[PDB]
Amino acid sequence: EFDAKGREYVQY
Amino acid sequence: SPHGYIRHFENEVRDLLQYVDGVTPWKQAQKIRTYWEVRSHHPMPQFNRPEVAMHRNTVGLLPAHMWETDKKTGKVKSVKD
Amino acid sequence: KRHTHFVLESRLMYEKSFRDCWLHSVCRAISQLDEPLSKTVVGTHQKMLQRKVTCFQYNQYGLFKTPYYRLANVDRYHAVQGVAGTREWVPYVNVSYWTMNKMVRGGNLLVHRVHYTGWGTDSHLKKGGWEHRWNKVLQRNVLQYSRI
Amino acid sequence: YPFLRRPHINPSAPYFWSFMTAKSQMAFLPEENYITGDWTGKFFVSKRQVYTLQHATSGAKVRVKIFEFNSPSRWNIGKEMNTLT
Amino acid sequence: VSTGEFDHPPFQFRQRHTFNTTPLHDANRFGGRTAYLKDPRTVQFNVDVWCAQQTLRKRWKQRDWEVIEIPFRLVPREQQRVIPELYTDIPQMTDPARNDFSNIRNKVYDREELQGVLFPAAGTMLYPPLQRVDKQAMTLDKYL
Amino acid sequence: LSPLEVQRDVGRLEPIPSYAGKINADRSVFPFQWKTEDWYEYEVAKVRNRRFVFENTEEDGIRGSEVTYKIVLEGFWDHHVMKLAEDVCMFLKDVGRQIVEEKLVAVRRLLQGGAVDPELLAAFNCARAGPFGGYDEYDKEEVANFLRSDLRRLEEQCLSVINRCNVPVPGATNIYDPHTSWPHVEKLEPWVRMAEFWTSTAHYEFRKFFRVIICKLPFQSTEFEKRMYDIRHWLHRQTSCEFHTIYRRNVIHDSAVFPTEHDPATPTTHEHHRMFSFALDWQSAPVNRLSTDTVREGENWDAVAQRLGCSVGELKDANAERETIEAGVVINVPVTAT
Amino acid sequence: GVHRVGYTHPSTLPVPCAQRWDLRLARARIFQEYIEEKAPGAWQLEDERSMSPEFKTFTGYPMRDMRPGYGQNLPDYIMKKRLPNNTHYELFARRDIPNEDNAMYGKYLYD
Amino acid sequence: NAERFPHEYHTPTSRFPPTPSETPATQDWMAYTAKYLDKQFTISAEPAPVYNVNKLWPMQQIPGKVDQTPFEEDQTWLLHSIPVQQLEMHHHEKDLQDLPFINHEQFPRSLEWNAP
Amino acid sequence: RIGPIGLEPHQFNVPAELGFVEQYDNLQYKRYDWQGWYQRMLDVHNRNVSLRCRICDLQRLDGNGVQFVDMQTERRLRILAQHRVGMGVLKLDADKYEDQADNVTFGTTKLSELLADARKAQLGEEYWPSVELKVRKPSGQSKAHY
Amino acid sequence: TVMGKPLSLVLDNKAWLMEMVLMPFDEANLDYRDFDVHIVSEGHAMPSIANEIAA
């Protein structure tokens, strides 16, 4: 899966 | 009723001014003098500050008609009424 | 008894502040203006009006003009006298350090303890401290409103 | 102690008008120079009252918390009683 | 990013002029304007005012243009739009359609380009025509 | 080979990722470089346009709504406020379900068939000159078509609300997602006030936790407003609530009381906007404009209209009481008189 | 660069356009904005401590005027201040009572 | 005799920096050269457009008022007479909140709280 | 949707959003003497009403057939509403009076005045606000001829 | 690039600070030119981060 920051920047 | 700032009290400032004008006589108001008006009686009310124009001070600005100075050091020893 | 009387007269001083602040502010401002007061009134008219305004301000005895901080340290339960702005006084509950410690030990009040070497948990306080939180509360109170 | 918030608040020549004196000279005299309302008379005059030419004149009485100020001269005009002490 | 100092040094004791330390309030820290100097809060406020003065002077010296107010008709197509006031909308790109991705608010127009709308009364070219180099010409740079 | 395409595991052979060497390098996409002034403007605008949001719009799905209610629930403990939020959601979900159901019934009935209101038809044929040339003339059939379009979009919004209300189930529920449940709970930063005082010093902080329950309805239901306001009476122990309402409201700009005029001959200067000028120089808007006039000597019917800047026909319509004008009589100037 | 600020009437320009000083006076009329005549053109300071996004305490609004000697005495300050007529001082004055019961009700009546 | 002593009689509405007197021909180097350096200079001044030019941008000054644009040197700001803050700081709205350490609040609302 | 509806050509209907707050107490300030003045304090504290309208909705044909808000009117209105306009929404926080019923009227009056002054851009080109172009100083080539 | 500016300008052209940023590539036996990076700061904002802890 992804970490919190990875998910945040993918959404960005 | 307005709230908060004074600029929101549009009518009330007008009412205060009208009331104070209608209640205050100029005979009573002639008495209040200003700080500079009071100062004017001092022998030398106006000084140049050391911030801007201290160099403008000229020997004429002193009240030299009412005191006497010593001949050796130059400082005033006494003052006259 | 005597302490309750002192507290009550402080409350009456607050009430005087409420009643007198608007009038004292407007009178002081109108009396302290050197520039013209308006298009309609200017010159001799405005100067005489300023003289009348300062006369009315001076004749009107009892106007609460004192700074607000001079009665912002009056304790409510005990007679312990502190100073506002120092660790001897608590601003929110508005009690001195003695009263605050007594209330904590009584347990009636709900306050959460944080490490005494630190900035608690509020992120705004942790970031810039008292100054930053002081600015943030103003941001909440006024600056977020698009004045009209 | 908070800055400049104490309950209790050698003359300088160049700063004679700028030490313990009003910021603005155009400002009118304070409450202490005038009779506000119906009075029986003051026991003392406020220490912030500005000395005036009327003060330098006959000056029936001058009492400042106790001080007499029975040496009237024009050099005392324009400054408050606290720094005239 | 700025490498200049923004905070005033703290006072926890009297310092000396040593190898790694200098006296507090000397004529070296803020350009010698510490001669005016108590309370750290007011001292820091004065230092903030001085820093803002420096920011303003450099920001104004960086400014090489002028803000003549031109009527709508006599204006370039890129400025013939509705431009929101500062801090009201997203930083506006001049023209994404023509691949001009640039803050429209920062656009600067050469004075030798609006002589047709400025100075319409003067029939002589007060500023001579701008000389533009030819890119499609073999020159010393393009020769190797 | 790319660094992502070389095999690093000397004891295992992995499959090359699909992105190994396929991502072009452009400076306008990555890495991010920008101008300092543009960044400054971006930040300041972002922080200043926080509340410049038009919550109620004619969008579809979640974004679309007409009335937005927010209930800020405050408590002394995060779990207290969380449980109270769950209770209030289980309440409002069912209440809004029933109310949107009884609205959906009426919407369906109106779609099946109805009659056009003459007030509505006049509202449509009120404008003097329409988009097509000058005067326009709508028909009740066209008005009913407009109504059908509005009621269809309202039906879609009501159905979305009902479906979202029916989604949440105890086996699998998530009330913090606007897509899953209706209404949804969003978190709000707790108010924390730390105080340090003598004891040798101690740090104790007051705390107050918040949760916001948001209900977005595509219609104003005063019944729902009542049932929402009635929550404070059975609110949880030592928990409080405050209500924020953002609703669409029609505002008229009466061009008669607020007209557009040529800028006066002698323009205002900075003296009229001086200190204390707000009380001494300026009237409160609007400025009164005389609706009544007196007739001068020997004024013709068209002379009065020309002096008032109004048309003769509109002057007649306004003053139909009197057939003819006599000197010194009182007349009613039409509002559109210039 | 000491100078005199100018103004062009819309009639003088070859193609008229609403001038920005005219728009400023219109805004002043609408929103009752007091315009200080003696405002210096040189003193345009922004509190970078709040405006600059590179600072710890960044907020989009100016938190200070960057003017030394901006005291309470000035009429400009007096006219721009919030009055304490319904602020937390009212809550203090009417609530921080030695006994909550004598703000809650009268002891004589309750007895 | 007030005009002869600028720093004195500092009226409450006045504020630093005081605007110097307006030198007649100083708006540009062409005017300066024409008047003071080159008497026989042809071009009186640098050409001025027909539309309105705002020197104090984005600040709108009262038209017809002598004013000075913000300085471009450090020495001007340093040597110019600007007083330093000496008494307590005052703000038109941070006065109800007594001090940073006191900061009176009305209600315990979140600092993230948004007015609708 | 509540609010008046204007029929004559001199009336334009503007759909707007009115955001307000209503807070009532139930814990400690509910049922005794401080109830009244505490409620008054809460109401005056929440006296603000935010009236916001979309320029997109304002850009519609008037009753006279002319667009109510054209591009030049939008320019003039944006200039007159310095910080009151952001991201396409003209927002006005009315808090002058202690009552939301007074603030709605105050905000309506101010919106009407702002719109009326903005519509001066429809009278003639002279009322179209000028555009501020950062014109460069003369280039080095021009400065050479000095 | 760190927060929209080149590293040599963010870290004030200090060799002893940028070599720490280089270290992960060298320890990994990798070429820094095969990768382009952007570092965003979520901590206490400051005008200059040219220090060993930030590095």
Added chain:
Amino acid sequence: RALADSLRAYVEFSTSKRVEPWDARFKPFDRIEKDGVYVLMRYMMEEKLQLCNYHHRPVKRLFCNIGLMGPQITTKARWKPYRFATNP
């Protein structure tokens, strides 16, 4: 009379030509008296320096106003400290 002494002393010292404020040790005042800054001072400032009586504030402000020296006239020129210029 004590106040008289102080006021007279202040006024008298105001007129004094105590010292030339500039520090000849450091540039730009380092140059020989017959060249550089001293030429400008001798041929454009003599009528003003003697009027101001060599007070440090008037001297600095005149130097700044002349402009032919530029910002360096205080960005790099070191004057004497307050008292060290005050003493004659």
Added chain:
Amino acid sequence: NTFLTSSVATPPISVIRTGPKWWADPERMVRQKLMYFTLGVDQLPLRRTAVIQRDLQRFHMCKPPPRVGDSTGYKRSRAAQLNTWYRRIQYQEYHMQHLFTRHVWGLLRVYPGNTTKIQGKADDGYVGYDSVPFHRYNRAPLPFPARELYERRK
């Protein structure tokens, strides 16, 4: 130079005990290397100081093991010997820095701080505009203005 006030001397050991803070501050060492390079001489003591400090900073967080104890003490003696050798190299570079900086100041006609000696120009302490009106050590009156060590021409 613009640090012209009376100063306080500091023993080289306490100067060097700073290490990475100020004594071996990398920026300061870089500009000392630049001074030497511009003068056109090898920076060998500087490079010895640099490597000493690099290797010491590489371990400054490691706590040495508790010594078991060897009667011969050759291990402790060698450790102290190397420590003193490093200290002496650092002392040499410290003295070099002052020597060449004073030489450069004399070359460029830069006035040093009070009570500072420049070999060619002021063998005894140069004092200019000091708080004490006389020589701090020689008890003699300093002249007004301060003595000009160099010529006037620029």
Added chain:
Amino acid sequence: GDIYYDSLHDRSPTWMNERYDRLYGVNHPDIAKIGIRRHLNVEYVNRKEVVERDAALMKKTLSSGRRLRHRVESS
């Protein structure tokens, strides 16, 4: 994650981003397991101070009891 479309232990770094006190008598053959001191487990505002005082009291009582045991044995 999302309930419907079922990311277990993503390693959730909690060290990149950012004390308790017992009654001191949990494991002791002399301190009775049951007693009125159990009520101290539901004190929150001054838990640190109350449990510190309780720990000091129990320390002193145990030490004095042991001292009496030794004195009685030796006498």
Added chain:
Amino acid sequence: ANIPRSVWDPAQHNPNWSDSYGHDITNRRAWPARKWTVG
């Protein structure tokens, strides 16, 4: 009405609604770790 029909009307009962004990019993359920041979 005051009490919504979905509460008492049998026709509007949610088929997917579950009991109030089984889910919590399952949550309290403790499953022994999958015991492999090595790890």
Added chain:
Amino acid sequence: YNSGYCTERTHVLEENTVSIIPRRELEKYMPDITIGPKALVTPVSLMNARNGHRVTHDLLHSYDPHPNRVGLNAATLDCRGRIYRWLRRGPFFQVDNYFRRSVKLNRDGTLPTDFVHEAPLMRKIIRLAHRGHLKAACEEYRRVTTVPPVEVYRALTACCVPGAKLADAVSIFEDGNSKLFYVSRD
């Protein structure tokens, strides 16, 4: 003792006898500016601006029932019981009590309309309303302290009719209908 109007001939400080400075000789030493008690009482229009207060004594004066006679006096907050009363007063105490003390229905049922002091003001209202100056008439009505006559409402609605300003007319009728004894219900 030093506050004023104390009628104390001498006072004791630090065990000393201190006399007073009479008014006659105090006038020379400080000029007398005495407008009178009228400057201590603001008009009714400033009650809400001063938070319901109208008098500027050093003691908070309250309006509440515990031709040449019109005028209302106020009590003083001296007793602790009355101080608590003041701290427990409702949001509208000064204004409500002053309004109900000044304005009441007559024993014969006639309204309090006939007020001599406000009579010319109401005639001005009638004249402005008949002339059609609705905004000026409203501004003047803002100053009214007592119940205006029914003719005032008649003229206001008459000047509202020609402009078809139903909003203003309904606002006027509502202001006069339930708040002022249904004077406007005509």
